[PDB]
């Protein structure tokens, strides 16, 4: 359950830095239009990027 959550956090962390960025989210989300993709990514960042660094960290993901 915690294992699951961490598994799914790491799934699209392609560079291994333990942070999810919008390009990694774009892969996770995906043919959808670019504006729809932007809307979804911008939504995640607005929901969850509490320190406004452009990354979702594990604390921000798990909430």
């Amino acid at each position: 359950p915690q294992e699951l959550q961490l598994h799914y956090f790491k799934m699209h962390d392609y560079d291994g830095n333990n942070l999810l960025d919008g390009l990694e989210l774009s892969t996770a989300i995906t043919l959808m239009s670019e504006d729809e993709l932007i809307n979804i990514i911008d939504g995640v960042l607005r929901d969850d990027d509490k320190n406004n660094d452009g990354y979702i960290d594990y604390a921000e993901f798990a909430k």
Partner: peptide, 16 residues
């Protein structure tokens, strides 16, 4: 620094 995804690209899934 804030990473700006809309102005960026990289692998390993660079191209749609």
């Amino acid at each position: 620094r804030r990473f700006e995804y809309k102005y960026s690209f990289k692998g390993p899934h660079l191209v749609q």
